[PDB]
Amino acid sequence: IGFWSTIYKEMTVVDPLEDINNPNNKISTAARKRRKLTMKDGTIRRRAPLSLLESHTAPVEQVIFDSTDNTVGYSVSQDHTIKTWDLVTARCIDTRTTSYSLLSIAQLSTLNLLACGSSARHITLHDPRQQQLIGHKNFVSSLDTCPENEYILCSGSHDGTVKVWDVRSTSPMYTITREDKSVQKGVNDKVFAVKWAEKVGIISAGQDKKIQINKADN
Amino acid sequence: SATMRSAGSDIFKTGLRNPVRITVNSSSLKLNYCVVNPAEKLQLLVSILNNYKFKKCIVYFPTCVSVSYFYSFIQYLGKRNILVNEVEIFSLHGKLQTSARTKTLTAFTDSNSVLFTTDVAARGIDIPDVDLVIQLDPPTNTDMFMHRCGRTGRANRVGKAITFLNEGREEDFIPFMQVKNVELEELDLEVKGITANFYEDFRNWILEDRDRFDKGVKAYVAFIKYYSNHSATSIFRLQSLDYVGIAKLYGLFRLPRMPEITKYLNWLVDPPVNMDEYKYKDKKREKERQETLKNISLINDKKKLKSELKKKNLAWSDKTLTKERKLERKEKMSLKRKAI
Amino acid sequence: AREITDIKQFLELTRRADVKTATVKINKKLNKAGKPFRQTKFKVRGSSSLYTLVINDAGKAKKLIQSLPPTLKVNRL
RNA sequence: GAUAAGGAUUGGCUCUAAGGGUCGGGUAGUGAGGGCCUUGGUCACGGCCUUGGCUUGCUACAAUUAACGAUCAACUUAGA
RNA sequence: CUGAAUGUGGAGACGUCGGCGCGAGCCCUGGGAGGAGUUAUCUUUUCUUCUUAACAGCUUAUCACCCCGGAAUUGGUUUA
Numbered sequence A: 001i002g003f004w005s006t007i008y009k010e011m012t013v014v015d016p017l018e019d020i021n022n023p024n025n026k027i028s029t030a031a032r033k034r035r036k037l038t039m040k041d042g043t044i045r046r047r048a049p050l051s052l053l054e055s056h057t058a059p060v061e062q063v064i065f066d067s068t069d070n071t072v073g074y075s076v077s078q079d080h081t082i083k084t085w086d087l088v089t090a091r092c093i094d095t096r097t098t099s100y101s102l103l104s105i106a107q108l109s110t111l112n113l114l115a116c117g118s119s120a121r122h123i124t125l126h127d128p129r130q131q132q133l134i135g136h137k138n139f140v141s142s143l144d145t146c147p148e149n150e151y152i153l154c155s156g157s158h159d160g161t162v163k164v165w166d167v168r169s170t171s172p173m174y175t176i177t178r179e180d181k182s183v184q185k186g187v188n189d190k191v192f193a194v195k196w197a198e199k200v201g202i203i204s205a206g207q208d209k210k211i212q213i214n215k216a217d218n
Numbered sequence B: 001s002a003t004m005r006s007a008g009s010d011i012f013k014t015g016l017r018n019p020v021r022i023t024v025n026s027s028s029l030k031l032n033y034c035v036v037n038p039a040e041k042l043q044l045l046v047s048i049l050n051n052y053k054f055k056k057c058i059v060y061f062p063t064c065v066s067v068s069y070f071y072s073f074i075q076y077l078g079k080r081n082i083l084v085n086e087v088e089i090f091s092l093h094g095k096l097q098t099s100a101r102t103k104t105l106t107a108f109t110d111s112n113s114v115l116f117t118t119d120v121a122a123r124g125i126d127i128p129d130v131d132l133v134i135q136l137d138p139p140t141n142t143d144m145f146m147h148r149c150g151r152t153g154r155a156n157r158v159g160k161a162i163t164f165l166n167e168g169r170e171e172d173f174i175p176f177m178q179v180k181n182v183e184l185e186e187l188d189l190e191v192k193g194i195t196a197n198f199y200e201d202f203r204n205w206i207l208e209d210r211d212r213f214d215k216g217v218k219a220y221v222a223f224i225k226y227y228s229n230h231s232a233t234s235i236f237r238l239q240s241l242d243y244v245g246i247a248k249l250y251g252l253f254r255l256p257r258m259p260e261i262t263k264y265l266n267w268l269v270d271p272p273v274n275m276d277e278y279k280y281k282d283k284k285r286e287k288e289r290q291e292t293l294k295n296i297s298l299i300n301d302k303k304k305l306k307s308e309l310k311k312k313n314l315a316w317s318d319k320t321l322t323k324e325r326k327l328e329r330k331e332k333m334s335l336k337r338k339a340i
Numbered sequence C: 001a002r003e004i005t006d007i008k009q010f011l012e013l014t015r016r017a018d019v020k021t022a023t024v025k026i027n028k029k030l031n032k033a034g035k036p037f038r039q040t041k042f043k044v045r046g047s048s049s050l051y052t053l054v055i056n057d058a059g060k061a062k063k064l065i066q067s068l069p070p071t072l073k074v075n076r077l
Numbered sequence D: 001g002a003u004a005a006g007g008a009u010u011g012g013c014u015c016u017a018a019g020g021g022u023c024g025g026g027u028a029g030u031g032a033g034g035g036c037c038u039u040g041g042u043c044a045c046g047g048c049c050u051u052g053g054c055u056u057g058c059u060a061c062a063a064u065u066a067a068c069g070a071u072c073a074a075c076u077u078a079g080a
Numbered sequence E: 001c002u003g004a005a006u007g008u009g010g011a012g013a014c015g016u017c018g019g020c021g022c023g024a025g026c027c028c029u030g031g032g033a034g035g036a037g038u039u040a041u042c043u044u045u046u047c048u049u050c051u052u053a054a055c056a057g058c059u060u061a062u063c064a065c066c067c068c069g070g071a072a073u074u075g076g077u078u079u080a
Helices: A016-021 A029-039 B010-014 B038-049 B064-079 B098-109 B142-151 B170-179 B198-206 B210-228 B243-249 B259-264 B283-294 B296-312 B317-337 C007-014 C058-066
Strands: A060-063 A075-077 A081-086 A091-097 A102-108 A113-118 A122-126 A132-134 A140-145 A152-157 A161-166 A174-177 A191-197 A201-206 A212-214 B029-035 B056-060 B087-092 B112-117 B132-135 B159-165 C002-004 C021-030 C036-045 C050-055 C073-076
Touching (some): A016 A029, A102 A152, A113 A152, A122 A140, A140 A191, A152 A191, A152 A201, A161 A201, B029 B170, B038 B056, B038 B064, B038 B159, B064 B087, B064 B112, B064 B198, B064 B210, B087 B098, B198 B210, B243 B259, C007 C050, C036 C058, C050 C058
Parallel strands (some): A102 A140, B029 B159, B056 B132, B087 B112, B132 B159, C021 C073
Antiparallel strands (some): A060 A075, A075 A081, A102 A113, A113 A122, A122 A132, A140 A152, A152 A161, A161 A174, A191 A201, A201 A212, C021 C036
């Protein structure tokens, strides 16, 4: 995981030339040309991370900030784990092991839960100091939380259907499908991104090029 | 082929089945020759280039290294304005890259131009508007001679061919061509512009860069080898060859170590010049030369050990050492017994 | 006689009903590198042949020794 | 073992498949990107939105014998 | 990786001589590790041991044969 700054003046600068120019020990002409061909789109500013949070053993799928602390960094990876991070010291504090790989993570700090959608077609609820939502038929790729309701969260999955869930329940209360005549259910129909926008509703996007908007207001 | 009769019985090596030989026969061009001392030959070339009237002159050289070396030296002479004419000088030998050869040939074919070429351009190819052909030396084989001077005379055009002879066995080349039904009318050309300086100029231009010295000596040795592989052995004799004259022609100041030089015949410049102070003028190779100089004794000892091991591996070497022992003992005994 | 390379085949041979004893033979010998080593031959005879397993590794030979049945008489050398 | 020799100053013919890989060429004008500047409003030395002055792109003349140079990687005495 | 009557084929099973190639035993011989003899003088000296059976597993072939191809500028080739 990379810990980065919005203000680029606060990071050490990296010089692509310096690797092959300052030592210049045994770099071949082919290597030099290959390195030079990576800077044809002008000389754009380049920066190094503030820190590297490295404890996972498999690729990391999502990382989020704590909705209150802004120092706690819950993340999910493919090594079956949810890891919380101390951003000040840049280390893992606590680790929870799940039975299947995790693909999406969302936080409900107003009722203190973590919803992690896994590759096992279900969303696990964890207490970051229990219940699982089922009904999806493929990888759960993205999650989001309703801004006005405290118990409602949306989930998108690779089966082309978005689903809205109440935390207290265990079954979907509405199942949004992609409204398109040219879309096929299993050929090109996936949801890679879903968003709960407090002013327009539910935004869905994926394998179909269309960006879909659904009301999702009471 | 324009000389298909020469390949007499070798045509059946091709595998002819039902063959029919065809012979087609018809002063278009002039065939001259000059008998001059070799050390003047290049100067004579210059005296032809800046005086004769031509649109294209093709000058033939024996070897490729000679083509490059003399091309560079003539360019240097033209820098000093030794020859003053609207002449553009090109070099084209067959060891170049193919693209360079094509570009040079298409530039020459396309305003008064001189070409320094080996036998690559002698046969087949036709450059229009070629007026003069010079053969700085007669070819290694005489069959190609008719091709080398054959680039001119198309449609009975007024073109001249000139050849140069070494003054020693020149009495044999003309009758040899006459028997082959070729008449060479002797031409007398004055050696203009040489009193004393030309060889001095060549020598002092060689002293500037050791690469020039290397190219000159390499070209001279290559010509000696080329002369070794000569048909009509009686006409072109290695013994009668003017080794000093040829070396003077190339601007050299020392005869390269050859079996020919040792047997059939040193410092041409009477005050000798040492190679230690001779600078290669090229930065990458200067340090290599200095390193080799600092490793003179080590390489000398490597060669000494190689020589000793060759001595021990020769035919019945132990017996040869025994015989040398006996001869040395008897001779050193007689060296005192006769005196006493 | 016969030579075998499979260790479990040797163990299966030593586990048969009609087995008398097994011989363990030690040889000190040189390898192609010149370093001496200890080679263990485990010999047991089946119905009509004598099967020999040659092991040039001390640890593998020790594990095979430990894996022999406790009711099998073992002849050292 | 080819290639004219094998104590010496080794460099050795013409044409004809390949001879380890890779990279590299000027002088001028204007567009781009970086760097040092600087000027206003804005939020408690640091941001946010704005103002004027080493890399590469496009055109115009020389060079096209780069037939040059640079770098990486390989290699040792066949004599009894 | 079934095979009756019936009909065939192979091994058993076959003259003598010549040179060439290959293997084994014997002979010759270098180093080293032991033992014995001679030694007025010389002699790294003289003698002797340094072995691997039937059987079993892996691997190993001249000849012969198969496939492509189509040859005089006649090639290949044996001690013959």
